[PDB]
Design an enzyme around this catalytic site. Structure first.
Site, short mmCIF file in Angstrom:
data_model
loop_
_atom_site.label_atom_id
_atom_site.label_comp_id
_atom_site.label_asym_id
_atom_site.label_seq_id
_atom_site.Cartn_x
_atom_site.Cartn_y
_atom_site.Cartn_z
N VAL A 184 0.87 -1.05 0.09
CA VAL A 184 0.00 0.02 0.05
C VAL A 184 1.11 1.29 0.09
O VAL A 184 0.56 2.13 -0.55
CB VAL A 184 -1.10 0.06 1.37
CG1 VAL A 184 -1.69 1.54 1.30
CG2 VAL A 184 -2.09 -1.18 1.16
N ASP A 232 4.06 1.42 -1.08
CA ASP A 232 4.86 1.09 -2.27
C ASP A 232 4.07 1.89 -3.41
O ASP A 232 4.64 2.35 -4.24
CB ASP A 232 5.20 -0.04 -2.44
CG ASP A 232 6.43 -0.61 -1.47
OD1 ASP A 232 6.89 0.12 -0.58
OD2 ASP A 232 6.36 -2.08 -1.24
N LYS A 266 21.22 3.28 28.11
CA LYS A 266 22.25 4.02 27.40
C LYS A 266 22.52 3.31 26.33
O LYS A 266 22.94 2.30 26.43
CB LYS A 266 23.40 4.09 28.46
CG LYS A 266 24.63 4.90 27.95
CD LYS A 266 25.63 5.24 29.08
CE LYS A 266 26.47 6.46 28.76
NZ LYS A 266 27.09 6.07 27.13
C1 LIG Z 1 21.42 14.01 31.19
C2 LIG Z 1 22.36 14.04 29.96
C3 LIG Z 1 23.43 14.60 30.42
C4 LIG Z 1 21.52 15.06 28.74
N1 LIG Z 1 21.00 16.50 29.19
C5 LIG Z 1 22.04 17.79 28.86
O1 LIG Z 1 22.66 17.71 28.02
C6 LIG Z 1 21.43 19.00 29.39
C7 LIG Z 1 22.06 19.89 28.98
C8 LIG Z 1 21.97 21.26 29.59
C9 LIG Z 1 20.60 21.49 30.32
O2 LIG Z 1 20.23 22.71 30.98
C10 LIG Z 1 20.85 23.95 30.75
C11 LIG Z 1 20.43 24.92 29.67
C12 LIG Z 1 20.73 25.96 29.49
C13 LIG Z 1 21.97 26.49 29.84
C14 LIG Z 1 22.56 25.60 30.96
C15 LIG Z 1 22.04 24.34 31.17
C16 LIG Z 1 19.82 20.22 30.81
C17 LIG Z 1 20.40 18.98 30.31
C18 LIG Z 1 22.37 12.95 29.26
C19 LIG Z 1 23.54 12.61 28.52
C20 LIG Z 1 23.74 11.31 27.86
C21 LIG Z 1 22.48 10.32 28.06
C22 LIG Z 1 22.66 9.08 27.43
N2 LIG Z 1 23.81 8.54 26.62
N3 LIG Z 1 21.64 8.12 27.33
C23 LIG Z 1 20.44 8.73 27.92
N4 LIG Z 1 19.31 7.93 28.20
N5 LIG Z 1 20.34 9.99 28.71
C24 LIG Z 1 21.33 10.81 28.52
N6 LIG Z 1 21.33 12.04 29.09
N1 LIG Z 2 4.03 -0.33 5.60
C1 LIG Z 2 4.26 0.93 5.69
O1 LIG Z 2 3.73 1.76 6.51
C2 LIG Z 2 5.76 1.44 5.41
C3 LIG Z 2 6.05 2.55 5.52
C4 LIG Z 2 7.64 3.24 5.03
C5 LIG Z 2 8.51 2.12 4.35
N2 LIG Z 2 7.90 0.72 4.33
C6 LIG Z 2 8.76 -0.28 3.61
O2 LIG Z 2 10.37 0.12 4.05
C7 LIG Z 2 11.16 0.02 2.68
C8 LIG Z 2 11.80 1.10 2.57
O3 LIG Z 2 10.82 2.29 2.12
P1 LIG Z 2 11.43 3.67 2.24
O4 LIG Z 2 12.87 3.87 1.74
O5 LIG Z 2 10.78 4.51 1.47
O6 LIG Z 2 11.46 4.01 3.65
C9 LIG Z 2 10.02 -0.62 1.57
O7 LIG Z 2 10.20 -2.06 1.70
C10 LIG Z 2 8.84 -0.35 2.08
O8 LIG Z 2 7.84 -0.88 1.79
C11 LIG Z 2 6.60 0.34 4.85
#
Ligand SMILES: CC(C)(CNC(=O)c1ccc(Oc2ccccc2)cc1)c1ccc2c(N)nc(N)nc2n1
Ligand SMILES: NC(=O)c1ccc[n+]([C@@H]2O[C@H](COP(=O)(O)O)[C@@H](O)[C@H]2O)c1
Length: 313
Positions: free
Chosen positions: A37, A39, A116
């Site tokens: 659909v 496609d 993570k």
């Molecule tokens: C928590 C944070 C460090 C993101 N947050 C920020 O970078 C961030 C930055 C300015 C912020 O506030 C400010 C805004 C303006 C000025 C100063 C600080 C708040 C959060 C982080 C980093 C890596 C992550 C990772 N690999 N996996 C997942 N699941 N979460 C993660 N989260």
């Molecule tokens: N069934 C759906 O809603 C849907 C949506 C996007 C891509 N697809 C499939 O993903 C593949 C790649 O398509 P696109 O490169 O256009 O993202 C195709 O085989 C296509 O049929 C299916």
């Protein structure tokens, strides 16, 4: 047969319908219609765009295949820094983190727990709902402008559900299966294989030819709101739900824990489910849920004092 006037209107109908199907397929990982659909409609759009190239738009699903070839990447400043995370390696470290948090806040606090993802950190900026900049983290305050490459990552929306202006962050990674497939292709072509999914995603996003990137099967998980714009979230768990609401792909394994013991149980649960996931994870990230409390804890020079990453050995 088919005038520019009729095609102009039809093109928008197709983009909207196809983009919804793509949202379900790539962002929700739950398609509603069968591939044929999608496609069929896709081919109709391709025919219209081929006949009237002026109808091609940045949010058309046909642009996912890329085409531009850059000479290099422009610098991408992060006025709001992309912080790193402090690490923990034992149950002791985690409870120690909680102790420091309670010591500073003065009461028990809830923690949002997330996985993570082993990939490359990315920042996505939208203006009026339109994708305008994609960037790597780089050194935290300055990264690389990889907007064109990110336009090919299928789960990255080119137009949001709402015309809002925001900047969000998360991870761009390569699923295990795609990582395996990619290395096999490199082995077939006499190239050095990538040591792990992380290096594969990083190397893929460094490619200057967007056509190559488009075929790398990269995916995403967003978990940070940097520039809230009109967003209403007041807690990290709320932020994750809101990110999903506006159109981004989020990791479904998140859990709001009401106690440090629930936090440790979460760590043990996913340390066990690890091999069952279609993507690699290098740990668990624990964040004080309430933004008001995060504010009170503040940041060190390198990372927030309100979060810690439990790294798997
Ligand atoms: C928590 C944070 C460090 C993101 N947050 C920020 O970078 C961030 C930055 C300015 C912020 O506030 C400010 C805004 C303006 C000025 C100063 C600080 C708040 C959060 C982080 C980093 C890596 C992550 C990772 N690999 N996996 C997942 N699941 N979460 C993660 N989260
Ligand atoms: N069934 C759906 O809603 C849907 C949506 C996007 C891509 N697809 C499939 O993903 C593949 C790649 O398509 P696109 O490169 O256009 O993202 C195709 O085989 C296509 O049929 C299916």
């Amino acid at each position: 047969p088919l005038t520019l006037t009729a095609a102009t209107t039809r093109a928008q109908e197709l983009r909207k319908q196809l983009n919804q199907y793509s949202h379900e397929y790539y962002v929700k990982d739950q398609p509603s219609v069968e591939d044929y659909v999608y496609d069929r409609l896709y081919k109709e759009l391709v025919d219209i765009e081929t006949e009237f190239p002026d109808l091609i738009t940045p949010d058309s699903p046909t642009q996912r295949v890329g085409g531009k070839v850059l000479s290099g990447f422009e610098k991408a400043p992060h006025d709001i820094p992309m912080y790193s995370l402090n690490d923990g390696f034992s149950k002791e470290d985690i409870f120690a983190f909680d102790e420091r948090v309670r010591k500073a806040i003065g009461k028990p606090v809830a923690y949002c727990c997330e996985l993570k993802i082993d990939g490359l950190a990315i920042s996505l900026r939208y203006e009026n709902g339109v994708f305008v900049r994609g960037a790597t983290r780089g050194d935290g305050t300055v990264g690389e402008n990889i907007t064109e490459n990110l336009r090919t990552v299928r789960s990255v929306p080119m137009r949001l559900t709402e015309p809002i202006s925001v900047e969000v962050r998360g991870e761009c990674y390569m699923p295990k299966q795609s990582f395996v497939a990619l290395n096999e292709e490199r082995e077939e072509n006499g190239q050095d294989i990538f040591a792990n999914p992380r290096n594969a995603a990083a190397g893929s996003l460094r490619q200057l030819d967007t056509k190559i990137v488009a075929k790398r099967n990269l995916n995403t998980f967003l978990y940070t709101v940097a520039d809230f714009g009109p967003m209403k979230a007041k807690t990290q768990f709320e932020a994750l739900e809101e990110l999903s609401a506006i159109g981004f792909r989020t990791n479904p394994e998140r859990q709001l824990c009401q106690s440090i013991d629930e936090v440790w149980a979460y760590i043990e649960e996913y340390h066990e489910k690890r091999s069952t996931l279609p993507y690699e994870i290098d740990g668990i990230v624990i964040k004080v849920n309430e933004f008001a409390l995060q504010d009170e804890l503040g940041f060190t020079v390198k990372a927030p004092r309100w979060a810690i990453a439990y790294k798997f050995p």
